Design a binder for this molecule. Structure first.
Ligand SMILES: O=C(CO)[C@@H](O)[C@H](O)CO
Ligand SMILES: O=C(CO)[C@H](O)[C@@H](O)CO
Ligand SMILES: [N+]
Ligand SMILES: [N+]
Ligand SMILES: [N+]
Ligand SMILES: [N+]
Ligand SMILES: [N+]
Ligand SMILES: [N+]
Ligand SMILES: [N+]
Ligand SMILES: [N+]
Ligand SMILES: [N+]
Ligand SMILES: [N+]
Lengths: 475, 476
């Protein structure tokens, strides 16, 4: 028996994994988000906890615990949690999707011209370091009282164990990590006027950080089980799925589009949207990129076409007629807008639906290509989330992208599964890592049709040209 | 009684008019088109005849033609029929929608610097003259044998009468005609290595060119009746609709979109996409421009939005969310039309979409008319006909957008065959006035521009034009 916790943005999910890969029980609790001025996105750590606590007990009361040998954590990345010397919350956490600190990203990069090299990343307002420059510039009374900065999942760890600890995948997201070295950068820390004194200790995701406190273990109906370092949600997710070694990758077709690809050692393209982090396992790194959200776009397209749903939209796409010429659908994730180009008399809601599917696919494919151009070459890609559910569209995507696309079972549990697996790892020291990294069961595999792939390439050239030409119009 | 024949592209139509000018009977026969190569559009002139024969025979079953007093023809314009000295058909007819001779179009304009001045037109591959340069250049063996070049309806005439003749409206479409002078242009003909001897005799539409041959008359159950010159399909259509004097104008929102306006004498502004020809009546001239098929668009906006019928649609659009930002529909006129939906957001469903189509087609049509008007046409009203014209809502929208009074009438169904018959009427009743014999169709409803909605539309028209231009190069 193992426990995985995921500290999400919309809420907390906790699971119970069996000695096998089976999830036995699951509980979920909602979080709210706060927005007290513009570009601000905040939560309070206490609510993180109260929800987590609440969840573990819902969990306890659904199935028996105390068979549990280990517990792992995951969470939303990049969140600044500031603690005073008593371990009291200095101010509400500043989240990944907070945008207050643009000017500070600038200064930070100016103070450390080698920052892109050290971190392997473009500085963003949602990353941790610049948030801290912001506090010191604006909330100095608060800045002066800082004893520690934790990432959100590591706040939970504190409450859970009394230790200050992170994993490499999360810490990588602070911009205080030397990603190549898997250790803090004194240069980056100083420039924010901080020291290692104020960082948590660094672990690999599979490593033990401590154990439940007696109190907490009592509250929860279980022993002082060991707690592992865990990961950031995307990495922990990938661990869950089995995407753990070089050139393995997964594409998320849900509400929150992401491509995640394990790299052959550390790589970077620091002047792009391609970010590079430690994985939540020893000796691994990954790339990742925000994408077109397929699920969002299909939802909208459904309404736009008047087909009132996605399954209906996909169904209709299948009915489109094959002698009609290509229409091009151009989606602009940027504020969720679009263009149909090349409409003729031969184009009904069917044709229109096909064009939506193809154009989302055109975009997804190009997004993947961008990652790959950084030095990743997948043998296949694993497909998760709501838009992965159609057999027709999986095949389209493979034909367009030229990737073998894998659909697996259980791809849908989220980072919590990864956190649980990490626990299971640490609890089986006798076995090698490589005997301990299950992939999810292969439910269907989609190889690209060579003719269809070839016919799509020129359409993709056309897509790119049109997207490019109209972009400044839709902006 | 009277007969009108319309030699179309996709079929022939014959009609029987009574003394009072009503259609008493009609008959249609289908035609195929042959496309041996990309950009080639051809028909066998023999198929024109067999189709016309069939049709007239069928007509006669329905009703005796023994009391017909005159006969008229109209036809698909610009078709090149090449005959030898024995009236042998030398090759298949190269039609108006053939695009094989673009190069020749340029060559011709280079050769005859004043060509746009003489023809009143910019040279198009659909026009007759460049077609003949192409044959000269690509089929010299054929060219060597040319005795006669006939437009399609005029080949029909020869088969019916044994005469070689055309009218000013069809002849204008050759690019060999001096449109100002209503006579062939030696300059234009020479430049193609042709002479007047290779052209038919020219008439006005309403003049008699001959009579049915006995064998033909007999086969069709009629007298050796007099035959008028007729018109090209557009001009003949206009005559049927009563479009007849300077600044009369019609907009056909049918399966084939046209704006047709009778001008004050001859008007030349070629630089441009307005065409200028002779009208099928004496001392009459006209401008024309291909337009969107508002009909074949409205139908599409319907099925597109999965709306059922042209009034489902027109109704969806009125449920359009006022607070929604605009979707922009940009329809690009090639029949062939290609469209863009620009600026779609979360706010948009089928109601919005349907609104966008109406307004965008509207915007296109208004700009289309403006261009023609800028040439020197000033209508008191615009006659509005065709299946596209059926919606009251849209007709008004069109008026609001355009600033133009739109007169809705019924009965533009019949087509060029009507005008053809009207022409025969004229010739057969030489004492009667055109006022008498060429009435307007029934006025159904007159749409005046709403001053408030017109003003509201103007900035949208400006915006449309801006956007349309921007994407224009992308539509090739
Ligand atoms: O549109 C025009 C060209 O002037 C008509 O000629 C039709 O092409 C058929 O006659
Ligand atoms: O992936 C990251 C970090 O780059 C964030 O946690 C968001 O994706 C949450 O949706
Ligand atoms: N709460
Ligand atoms: N044990
Ligand atoms: N400062
Ligand atoms: N279906
Ligand atoms: N009469
Ligand atoms: N055909
Ligand atoms: N063609
Ligand atoms: N001559
Ligand atoms: N006779
Ligand atoms: N312009």
């Amino acid at each position: 028996m193992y426990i995985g916790i995921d500290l999400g943005t919309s809420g907390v999910k906790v699971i119970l994994l069996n000695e096998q890969g089976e999830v036995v029980a699951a509980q979920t609790e909602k979080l709210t988000v706060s927005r007290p001025h513009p570009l601000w996105s905040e939560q309070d750590p206490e609510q993180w906890w109260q929800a987590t606590d609440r969840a573990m007990k819902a969990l306890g009361d659904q199935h028996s615990l105390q068979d549990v040998k280990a517990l792992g954590i995951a969470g939303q990345m990049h969140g600044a949690t500031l603690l005073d010397a008593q371990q009291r919350v200095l101010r509400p956490a500043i989240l990944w999707n907070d945008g207050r600190c643009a000017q500070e990203c600038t200064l930070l990069e100016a103070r450390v011209p080698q920052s892109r090299v050290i971190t392997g990343n473009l500085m963003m307002p949602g990353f941790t370091a610049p948030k801290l420059l912001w506090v010191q510039r604006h909330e100095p009374e608060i800045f002066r009282q800082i004893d520690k900065v934790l990432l959100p999942k590591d706040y939970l760890r504190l409450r859970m164990t009394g230790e200050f600890a992170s994993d490499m995948s999360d810490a990588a997201g602070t911009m205080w990590l030397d990603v190549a070295k898997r250790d803090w950068s004194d240069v980056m820390l100083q420039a924010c006027d901080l020291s290692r004194d104020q960082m948590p200790a660094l672990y690999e995701g599979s490593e033990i950080t401590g154990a439940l406190l007696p109190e907490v273990a009592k509250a929860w109906g279980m022993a002082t089980v060991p707690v592992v370092a865990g990961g950031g949600d995307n990495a922990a997710g990938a661990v869950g799925v089995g995407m753990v070694d070089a050139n393995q990758a997964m594409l998320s077709l849900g509400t929150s589009g992401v491509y995640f690809a394990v790299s052959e050692g550390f790589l970077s393209k620091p002047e792009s949207a391609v970010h590079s982090f430690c994985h939540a396992l020893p000796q691994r790194w990954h790339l990742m990129s925000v994408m077109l959200s397929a699920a969002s776009c299909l939802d909208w397209a459904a309404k736009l076409t008047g087909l009132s749903n996605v399954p209906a939209l996909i169904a209709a796409a299948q009915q489109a007629d094959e002698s009609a010429e290509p229409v091009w659908f151009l989606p602009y994730l940027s504020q969720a807008k679009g263009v149909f180009f090349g409409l003729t008399h031969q184009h009904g809601p069917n044709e229109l639906a096909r064009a939506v599917l193809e154009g989302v696919g055109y975009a997804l494919a190009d997004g993947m290509d961008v990652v790959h151009a950084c030095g990743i070459k997948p043998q296949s890609v694993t497909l998760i989330g709501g838009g992965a559910r159609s057999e027709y569209w999986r095949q389209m995507l493979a034909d367009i992208s030229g990737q073998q696309l894998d659909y697996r079972t259980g791809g849908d549990v989220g980072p919590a599964l990864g956190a649980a697996r990490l626990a299971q790892i640490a609890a089986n020291p006798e076995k090698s890592l490589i005997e301990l990294l299950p992939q999810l069961p292969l439910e269907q595999s989609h190889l690209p049709d060579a003719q269809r792939y070839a016919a799509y390439q020129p359409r993709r050239e056309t897509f790119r040209r049109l997207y490019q030409q109209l972009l400044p119009l839709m902006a």
